[PDB]
Structure formats: structure tokens, C-alpha cells
Amino acid sequence: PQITLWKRPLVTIKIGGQLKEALLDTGADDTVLEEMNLPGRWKPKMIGGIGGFIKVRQYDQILIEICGHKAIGTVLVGPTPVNIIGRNLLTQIGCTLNF
Amino acid sequence: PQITLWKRPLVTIKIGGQLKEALLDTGADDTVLEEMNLPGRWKPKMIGGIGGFIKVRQYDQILIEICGHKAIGTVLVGPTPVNIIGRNLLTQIGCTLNF
Numbered sequence: 001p002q003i004t005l006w007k008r009p010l011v012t013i014k015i016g017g018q019l020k021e022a023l024l025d026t027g028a029d030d031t032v033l034e035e036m037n038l039p040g041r042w043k044p045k046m047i048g049g050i051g052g053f054i055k056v057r058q059y060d061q062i063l064i065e066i067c068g069h070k071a072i073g074t075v076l077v078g079p080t081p082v083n084i085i086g087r088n089l090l091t092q093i094g095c096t097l098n099f
Numbered sequence: 100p101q102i103t104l105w106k107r108p109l110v111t112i113k114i115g116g117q118l119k120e121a122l123l124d125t126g127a128d129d130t131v132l133e134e135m136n137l138p139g140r141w142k143p144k145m146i147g148g149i150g151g152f153i154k155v156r157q158y159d160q161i162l163i164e165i166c167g168h169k170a171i172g173t174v175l176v177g178p179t180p181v182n183i184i185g186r187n188l189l190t191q192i193g194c195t196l197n198f
């Protein structure tokens with residue numbers, strides 16, 4: 001679809017069989033979700049944001065459905081204030097900015 | 100134009116008479132710019148993201164041109180690692196997400 005920006009671009013995602021709300025975030029290189037139980041193996045990683053760096057759990061090759069568009073990529077799980085869908089997955093669903 | 104998300108959506112802006120590089124960020128409600136000494140009155144604010152909060156100075160009704168598209172709104176100035184163009188200005192230039 002076409003998404004205007006007068007409101008937050010929040011969408012419903014499906015990951016690990018559970019539905020969640022997340023923000024389409026073109027300013028994020030990576031996808032970062034709040035604490036949740038994901039299946040599979042993971043490795044410790046660090047990610048930096050506006051306030052500094054946090055420790056996260058890196059899950060690779062995770063199936064995630066964004067508004068009915070399938071993606072398979074890296075998902076970082078940790079103390080982010082907001083579930084954000086970053087460019088690593090936005091590219092998979094064919095998302096572009098237009099003005 | 101159309102901006103793909105293979106790389107950071109970095110564009111040239113003009114603010115306070117200066118050219119800068121800034122991120123078109125659908126995940127940001129408001130616009131946050133690197134430290135710069137702007138004239139006029141301002142009020143202090145704390146803004147939060149991954150890693151915590153930073154202190155910024157809120158300026159109102161600031162003019163910024165983003166790829167030849169003029170916008171005027173609130174800008175937050177402080178120690179951000181990147182200039183962030185948020186939805187408050189992305190709407191004014193006609194920016195949409197499309198997938």
C-alpha cells in the first residue's frame with residue numbers, strides 16, 4: 001500500500017507464530033523487537049541508538065510476516081522502547097520512500 | 100524522487116543557512132539535528148530511543164529545505180549521532196512509504 005506519515009507507520013507483524021505491533025522505521029538499519037521468546041539459536045550482539053548501546057539477542061534467518069509480506073532475515077531481541085522494522089526487512093518487502 | 104532502502108536514506112538538507120546530511124526517518128515522530136547554534140528561543144527536552152535518552156533544545160517554526168522541498172516546523176537540537184528528519188517534516192514534503 002501507500003502509507004502517509006501523519007500518524008506513526010504501525011503495522012501488525014507475525015513472528016514465531018504470534019502477532020505483534022511494530023513500527024516501519026526507515027531510520028533503522030536493523031530490526032529490533034522487545035523481549036520475547038523466539039525459537040532457535042542466537043548469539044549476543046550490541047546495537048547502538050540515539051541514547052547509546054544495548055545488548056541484544058541476534059536471531060538469524062527468522063521468518064517474519066509484515067502486513068502479509070513475507071521476509072526471512074535477522075531479528076534482534078532486546079530492550080528497545082519500540083518494536084521497529086528496519087531496512088534489512090523493509091527491503092525484502094519492497095518498501096521505498098517517495099516524495 | 101524515489102529512495103530505495105538498500106542504504107541509509109540520506110539526503111541533503113538546508114537549515115539555518117547550512118547544508119547538512121540527514122536521514123529520512125519514518126520511525127521518528129519529530130526531527131532531531133546535530134548540535135548547532137541556532138538563533139531564537141528554545142526550551143529543554145529529553146528524548147528517548149535505543150540506549151536511553153539525550154538532552155536536546157527544542158526550536159519551533161524552523162525552516163528546512165529537503166531536496167528542494169521546503170518545510171517549517173519543530174526541530175530538536177542536541178548530541179545525536181545523525182541528523183534525523185522525522186514525520187513532522189516528512190509530511191510537509193509529501194513523503195510516503197510504498198510497498
Ligand SMILES: CC(C)CN(C[C@@H](O)[C@H](Cc1cc(F)cc(F)c1)NC(=O)O[C@H]1CO[C@H]2OCC[C@H]21)S(=O)(=O)c1ccc([C@H](C)O)cc1
Binds near residue numbers: 029048127129130
Ligand atoms: C527507536 C525509534 C522508535 C526512534 N528513533 C528513530 C530511529 O529511526 C533510529 C534513528 C537513528 C538513531 C541513531 F542514534 C543512529 C542512527 F543511525 C539512526 N534508528 C535506530 O535506533 O536504529 C537502530 C537499529 O538499527 C540501527 O541502525 C541505526 C541505529 C540502529 S530515535 O532515533 O531513537 C528518535 C527518538 C525520538 C525522536 C523525536 C523526539 O520524536 C526522534 C528519533
